[PDB]
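Whiteboard transcription, Tuesday session. T.W. wrote the C-alpha cells on the left side:
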C-alpha cells in the first residue's frame, strides 16, 4: 500500500480494485485494496488517482484481466 510518510494504514478495508496512485516517496504506484484508495486520499487529498493516464499502462498487467 501507498505510504510515503504522508499517511499510515490504521483504518481501512481491503479489496480487489487495483488502481494507480501517486506517492511522495515514490510516485507512480499501482495497488489493489480499499486501503490504497483510502490512504491515498489521506496522504494527498489534493492529488488525483490516475484512472486513465498513459502512465497507468502498468496497472493493466498489475490488475486482473479476462
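and on the right, the sequence the group agreed on:
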Amino acid at each position: 500500500v501507498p505510504v510515503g510518510s504522508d499517511c499510515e494504514p490504521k483504518l481501512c478495508t481491503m479489496d480487489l480494485v487495483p488502481h494507480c496512485f501517486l506517492n511522495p516517496e515514490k510516485g507512480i504506484v499501482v495497488v489493489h485494496g480499499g486501503c490504497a484508495l483510502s490512504k491515498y486520499k489521506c496522504q494527498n487529498p489534493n492529488h488525483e488517482k490516475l484512472g486513465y493516464t498513459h502512465e497507468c499502462e502498468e496497472a493493466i498487467k498489475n490488475a486482473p484481466r479476462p
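Someone added at the bottom: Helices lie at 34-43, 59-62.
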